Amino acid sequence: ATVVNTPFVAVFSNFDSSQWEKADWANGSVFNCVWKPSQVTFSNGKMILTLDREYGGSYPYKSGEYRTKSFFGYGYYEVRMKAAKNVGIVSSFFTYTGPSDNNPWDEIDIEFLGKDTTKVQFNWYKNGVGGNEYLHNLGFDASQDFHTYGFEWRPDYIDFYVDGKKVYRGTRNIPVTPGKIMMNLWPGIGVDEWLGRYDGRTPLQAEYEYVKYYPNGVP
């Protein structure tokens, strides 16, 4: 149960599966899918999250959320990934803790709004209060090939990276509490102005090659 304070590397072409959990429940909130383990699969060196229709469940859609068992502190978080492109959905890479862990809801998000994959959205929560949505123009299409994305999280700031280059700093209401690293793919509900309305189109997938955490350095 020690916060991880040493380098962590999961390359999904070859990694210790035992450090991870597939979600098998519904997040609720603005997410119009249930998580199933069946929707997290592995091929071509990649972890694949697949949003697909769901049959006779309580949700119209199923999808995948993959989550570390460990909690991680201040430092540099990096994902290499290729977002799903579709109106109304999100592909993500983020850190999260909250009341499951007797913690405040402290979270740092990098989210690719399917409706426009030339943009990446940064956000974060502290004690359950967000309101930091910043949309960055990538200058390429995030769904077209893999790129790396990341943040150095520190007590006073979060610095956002795209392909090894720092493009933004947030300073307001920075989270404090070590979180689990997670990736998910979902259709939104009740959030049309933000995501567009979800199409209902399936299957859709987001693909990830790795996740790395460095307690010390940046690029």
UniProtKB/Swiss-Prot annotation:
Its EC number is 3.2.1.73. It catalyses: Hydrolysis of (1->4)-beta-D-glucosidic linkages in beta-D-glucans containing (1->3)- and (1->4)-bonds. Residues 1-219 form the GH16 domain. One of its GO terms (molecular function) is licheninase activity. It comes from the Bacteria. Keywords: Glycosidase, Hydrolase, Signal. GO terms for biological process: polysaccharide catabolic process. The active site is at E107, E111. May form part of a multienzyme complex (cellulosome). Belongs to the glycosyl hydrolase 16 family. This is Beta-glucanase. The lineage of its organism: Bacteria, Bacillati, Bacillota, Clostridia, Eubacteriales. The chain holds residues 30 to 248 of 334 of the full protein.
